[PDB]
C-alpha cells in the first residue's frame, strides 16, 4: 500500500485537498489508504470515499461509452474497415475500469461492510457494492451472469436492512431503491421487477411526506422524482 506510511489523519486531509484541486484519482488513492488503516469511517469520510471513486469510474465509463459507440459504427452499413485499433483501445479503457471497480469492491469486502457499525452505513456500503458490480456488468460478457448475481445479492441485502431499519422517506433508502430498480431494468432485463420496485418505493414514501420538515420533504421528493422519471421512461 503506497499509503501505508502516512498517518490516517494526513490521508483524510490530503483527500480534501485533492477534492479542492479536482484531482479525483489522487483523492481516491488517499481514501483507499485511509480505509486500509482498518478503522471505521465517519459519515463525512464515507462520502469522501464515494465522491472520489464515483468521479474516477464516471470518467472511465464515459470514455468507454464514447469508444464503444465508435466501435459499433465501425461495424454497420456505415462502411469503412478501420482495423483492430478501436476495439483494442476500448479494451484498454475497459480493463482500467474493471481495475477500479475491483479496488472499490475489495475495500467494501475487506472490511467496510462487516465492520460497519450502524444500519445507515451498512446500507450505504451494500448499495455501493451493488453499484460497482453493476458497473462491471455494463462491460462484461461472460462472467456477466456471475456479476449480475453478485449485484443483485448486494442490493437485496441492502434492501432488507433498509426496510427493517429506516423510514420509507429516508434518502439513502430511496436512492438504494432507485439504483436497484435501474439495475433490474438496464442490466438484469427484468423490466417488471424494476417497475414494481420503483412503484412500491414511490407509494410508501408518498404516504409519509406529510410528516416531514420542509427540508426533508424536498430531499425525499427530489429522489421520488428520479424514480418517477424512470417509471415514465419504462411505462
Amino acid at each position: 500500500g503506497a499509503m501505508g506510511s502516512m498517518e490516517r489523519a494526513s490521508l483524510i486531509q490530503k483527500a480534501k485537498l485533492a477534492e479542492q484541486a479536482e484531482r479525483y484519482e489522487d483523492m481516491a488513492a488517499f481514501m483507499k489508504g485511509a480505509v486500509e488503516k482498518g478503522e471505521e469511517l465517519s459519515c463525512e469520510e464515507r462520502n469522501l470515499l464515494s465522491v472520489a471513486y464515483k468521479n474516477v469510474v464516471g470518467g472511465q465509463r464515459a470514455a468507454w461509452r464514447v469508444l464503444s459507440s465508435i466501435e459499433q459504427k465501425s461495424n454497420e452499413e456505415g462502411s469503412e474497415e478501420k482495423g483492430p485499433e478501436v476495439r483494442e483501445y476500448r479494451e484498454k479503457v475497459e480493463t482500467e475500469l474493471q481495475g477500479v471497480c475491483d479496488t472499490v469492491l475489495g475495500l467494501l469486502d475487506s472490511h467496510l461492510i462487516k465492520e460497519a457499525g450502524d444500519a445507515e452505513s451498512r446500507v450505504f456500503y451494500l448499495k455501493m457494492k451493488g453499484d460497482y458490480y453493476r458497473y462491471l456488468a455494463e462491460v462484461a460478457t461472460g462472467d456477466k451472469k456471475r456479476i449480475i448475481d453478485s449485484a443483485r445479492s448486494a442490493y437485496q441485502e441492502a434492501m432488507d436492512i433498509s426496510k427493517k431499519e429506516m423510514p420509507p422517506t429516508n434518502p439513502i433508502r430511496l436512492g438504494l431503491a432507485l439504483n436497484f430498480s435501474v439495475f433490474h431494468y438496464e442490466i438484469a432485463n427484468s423490466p417488471e421487477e424494476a417497475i414494481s420496485l420503483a412503484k412500491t418505493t414511490f407509494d410508501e414514501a408518498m404516504a409519509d411526506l406529510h410528516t416531514l420538515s420542509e427540508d426533508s420533504y424536498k430531499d425525499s421528493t427530489l429522489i421520488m422524482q428520479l424514480l418517477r422519471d424512470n417509471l415514465t421512461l419504462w411505462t
Binding site: 436512492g175 439504483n179 428520479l226 422519471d229 424512470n230
Partner: peptide, 6 residues
Amino acid sequence: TPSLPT
C-alpha cells in the same frame, strides 16, 4: 436510464 447523481 439515470442512476442516483452526486
